[PDB]
């Protein structure tokens, strides 16, 4: 069954059926076994596509709700925006459940532990986008902690040019600016990360250079936007 779920997940990606992919990957994870670099990526692509479409949907329905509150689509927008929010919360809870009960625990390489802790921080960040009061602050603490535990491992056992490290630092600085309300901690983090990787670009093969400079460009783009 496990190989068959991984196969149908590769097929679901090709047909651009990401909720199907998501279900095939969750089932592959649930088998209890560890994920290879490939499986780890299929799990990331599946859910990032599922939740990305739910986030973009939520952004539109909140935009319409804001306008209708500027006065009378109001009752229908709130019911439906809350419906799309519950579907989002459920997808993030499925991912966070897979991370906390199977993936983070059963992780060997520091590289895969940082990968899963970046995922954990990300899904708590998406949860915090739509959260409101009591729950919002508890989610923001859970996001910070997971991003911090990952930053520590990546600083201690990963090169500054590593794309997981760069991607983690990018997401954490996005967390600081957008969620945690700290633009200075975001600019400080983004500049530092860009500079450390820049210093060691001279030691990368064609493929690695392309993978690192892609995320480095996103770091500096955000820097341009925030300054």
């Amino acid at each position: 069954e496990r190989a068959s779920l991984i196969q149908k997940a590769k097929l679901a990606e090709q047909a651009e059926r990401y909720e199907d992919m998501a279900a095939f990957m969750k089932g592959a994870v649930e088998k209890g076994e560890e994920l290879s670099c490939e499986e780890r990526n299929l799990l990331s692509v599946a859910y990032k596509n599922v939740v990305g479409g739910q986030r973009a949907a939520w952004r539109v329905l909140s935009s319409i709700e804001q306008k209708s509150n500027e006065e009378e689509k109001g009752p229908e927008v709130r019911e439906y925006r809350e419906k799309v929010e519950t579907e989002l919360q459920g997808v993030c809870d499925t991912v966070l459940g897979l991370l906390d009960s199977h993936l983070i625990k059963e992780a060997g390489d520091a590289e895969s532990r940082v990968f899963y802790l970046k995922m954990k921080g990300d899904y708590y960040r998406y949860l915090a986008e739509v959260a409101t009061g009591d729950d919002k602050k508890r989610i923001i603490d859970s996001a910070r902690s997971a991003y911090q535990e990952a930053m520590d491992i990546s600083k201690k056992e990963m090169p500054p040019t590593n794309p997981i490290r760069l991607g983690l630092a990018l997401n954490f600085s996005v967390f600081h600016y957008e969620i945690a309300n700290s633009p200075e901690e975001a600019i400080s983090l983004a500049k530092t990360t860009f500079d450390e990787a820049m210093a060691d670009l001279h030691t990368l093969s064609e493929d690695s250079y392309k993978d690192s400079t892609l995320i480095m460009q996103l770091l500096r783009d955000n820097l341009t936007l925030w300054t």
């Binding site: 996005v174 783009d221 955000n222």
Partner: peptide, 8 residues
Amino acid sequence: RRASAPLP
């Protein structure tokens, strides 16, 4: 609009 880490 800001950017976050891309898909692996």
